[PDB]
Amino acid sequence: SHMCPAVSCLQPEGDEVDWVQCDGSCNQWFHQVCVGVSPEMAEKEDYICVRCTVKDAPSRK
Ligand SMILES: [Zn+2]
Ligand SMILES: [Zn+2]
């Protein structure tokens, strides 16, 4: 169950639903249901998880 590093890990039949790769700074694959990806962001394939946002290192912190 380490192939998807997510606390709120919604597990279907396994290879049932559609996934998404959070590139950002982790590149870990999550099911859309697992991390609740809105179909707009999922269409854009653009889902940056909390770790990637908080370890993005902005121009002001
Ligand atoms: Zn999961
Ligand atoms: Zn990420």
Curated annotation (Swiss-Prot):
Domain of life of the organism encoding this protein: Eukaryota
Tissue expression from the record: Ubiquitously expressed, with highest levels in testis. Down-regulated in melanoma and glioblastoma. Up-regulated in breast cancer (at protein level).
Zinc finger (PHD-type): 4-55
Coiled-coil residues: none
Places the protein is found: Nucleus
Family: Belongs to the JARID1 histone demethylase family.
Cited function: Histone demethylase that demethylates 'Lys-4' of histone H3, thereby playing a central role in histone code. Does not demethylate histone H3 'Lys-9' or H3 'Lys-27'. Demethylates trimethylated, dimethylated and monomethylated H3 'Lys-4'. Acts as a transcriptional corepressor for FOXG1B and PAX9. Favors the proliferation of breast cancer cells by repressing tumor suppressor genes such as BRCA1 and HOXA5. In contrast, may act as a tumor suppressor for melanoma. Represses the CLOCK-BMAL1 heterodimer-mediated transcriptional activation of the core clock component PER2.
Domain remarks: Both the JmjC domain and the JmjN domain are required for enzymatic activity. However ARID and PHD-type 1 domain are not required for activity per se but contributed to recognition of the H3(1-21)K4me2 substrate peptide. The 2 first PHD-type zinc finger domains are required for transcription repression activity.
Oligomer status and interactors: Interacts with FOXG1B, PAX9, MYC, MYCN and RB1. Interacts with HDAC1, HDAC4, HDAC5 and HDAC7. Interacts (via PHD-type 1 zinc finger) with histone H3 unmodified at 'Lys-4'; the interaction is inhibited when histone H3 is methylated at 'Arg-2' or 'Lys-4'.
Implicated disorder: Intellectual developmental disorder, autosomal recessive 65: A disorder characterized by significantly below average general intellectual functioning associated with impairments in adaptive behavior and manifested during the developmental period. MRT65 patients have moderate to severe intellectual disability, developmental delay, and facial dysmorphism. Camptodactyly is present in some patients.
Protein name as annotated: Lysine-specific demethylase 5B
Species name: Homo sapiens (Human)
Section covered of the full-length record: 1487 to 1544 of 1544
